[PDB]
Design a protein around this ligand. Structure first.
Ligand SMILES: Nc1ncnc2c1ncn2[C@@H]1O[C@H](CSCC[C@H](N)C(=O)O)[C@@H](O)[C@H]1O
Length: 398
């Protein structure tokens, strides 16, 4: 009886409530609940069925949005506290300017039983609109159902992993009102999508790999080759296969903030991607060199340099090998793995006077600052990811 009943007192780091040891997703501190069945997962007990007996006062759909039943102020509190446990000290979480309509890219699985996101890998949640992306998704999804029905398009059967059409990935410039649709399919032939959509760019991508990925090789496009997003005075070309900061309104704060934290004239944009921070800084007359191991990112960074009339130099390079000799500030914005030991080595050997570390993984961040011959001087967290447990750190190291 009572071992399966109680009030939730805390959420763990992934945002799941904990009831007397049981993990209970989509619960809130102050909820009073009864766990009707548990499973074993990664050797922890997870409630698979539970009943809400009394609502938490912290209570108020998207894929990954495991905090969405929580009011937004409490999401920010959970983040402050998560960051304070982890980093051992206190850090402001800047709220996202918009918490609906903020997201500039979504992947919708297109499946035999519905268009939407995965629940349950087999089971699709069918949606008519994605509020984190916003109202463009309603129009895209109704146009997509007409396209599939009139053209009799083969859609993904996820039990059997078969079918031609697998994702519609929607991208939009929040500050430009340009919209891009990308159809991700298997091998085969996509009918002309032209007269079914009214967007700036339509892409067809073929994923020839065996992975379940919401991108593939560009097979063809109609309309614009690129759309644009604009962060203050800076334009960035958006393409289906390059990464861009997913919350355009917090990305504004993110670029503003990095440019406040840097020192000198010589900036290394390390792990630059498409040049978000290097190029915003080149436009405010800094002197910029960036490096990224991804070749296509670098190509996009160079196309972005061209459209922004700045002079910033981007090259392909690995962090096992990039040199940091000669700079006033190094910006690092590493992948999940964190800083390569060799680059920390070379940074401690050359010690540039400021490193600005941008991270979405506060624990790898702290692992790396303790490996660095450097002190956290300033740190601010930005709520780049409303409704999920993730947060983004910007720290000035010295
Ligand atoms: N060993 C390595 N060396 C250099 N770059 C790497 C790397 N492993 C991954 N990367 C790159 O690290 C970057 C981390 S994301 C960087 C985001 C970028 N500042 C932006 O504004 O969009 C990615 O672009 C990825 O291509």
């Amino acid at each position: 009886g009572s071992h399966m009943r109680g009030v939730i007192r805390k959420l763990n780091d992934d945002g799941f409530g904990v009831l007397k040891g049981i993990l209970v997703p989509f619960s809130a501190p102050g909820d009073e609940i009864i766990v009707e069945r548990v499973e074993r997962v990664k050797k922890r007990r997870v409630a698979s069925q539970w009943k809400l007996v009394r609502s938490s006062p912290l209570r108020v759909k998207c894929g990954g949005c495991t905090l969405q039943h929580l009011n937004y102020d409490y999401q920010l509190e959970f983040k402050r506290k998560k960051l304070k446990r982890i980093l051992g000290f206190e850090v402001e979480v800047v709220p996202s300017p918009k918490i609906f309509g903020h997201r500039n890219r979504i992947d919708l699985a297109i499946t035999k039983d519905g268009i939407g996101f995965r629940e349950k890998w087999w089971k699709i949640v069918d949606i008519d609109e994605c509020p984190v992306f916003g109202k463009t998704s309603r129009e895209a999804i109704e146009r997509l159902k007409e396209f599939i029905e009139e053209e009799k398009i083969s859609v993904w059967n996820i039990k059997k992993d078969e079918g031609f059409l697998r994702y519609m990935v929607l991208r939009e410039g929040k500050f430009t009102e340009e919209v891009m649709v990308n159809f991700v399919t298997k091998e085969g032939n996509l009918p002309d999508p032209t007269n079914y959509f009214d967007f700036d760019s339509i892409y067809w991508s073929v994923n020839r790999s065996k992975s379940d990925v919401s991108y593939g090789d560009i097979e063809r496009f109609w309309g614009k080759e690129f759309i644009r997003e604009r962060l203050d005075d800076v334009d960035y070309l958006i393409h289906p296969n390059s990464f861009f900061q997913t919350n355009s309104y917090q990305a504004v704060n993110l670029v503003r903030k990095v440019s406040e934290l840097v020192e000198g004239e010589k900036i290394l944009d390390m792990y630059s991607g498409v040049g978000t921070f290097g190029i915003y800084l080149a436009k405010r007359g800094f002197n910029v060199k960036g490096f990224d191991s991804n070749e296509f990112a670098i190509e996009m960074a160079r196309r972005n340099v061209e459209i922004n009339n700045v002079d910033a130099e981007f090259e392909v390079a690995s962090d096992r090998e990039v040199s940091v000799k000669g700079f006033d500030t190094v910006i690092v914005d590493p992948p999940r793995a964190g800083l390569h030991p060799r680059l920390v080595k070379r940074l401690n050997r050359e010690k540039p006077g400021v490193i600005v570390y941008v991270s979405c993984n506060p624990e790898t961040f702290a692992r790396d600052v303790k490996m660095l011959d450097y002190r956290i001087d300033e740190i601010v967290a930005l709520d780049m990811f409303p409704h999920t447990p993730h947060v983004e750190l910007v720290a000035k190291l010295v």
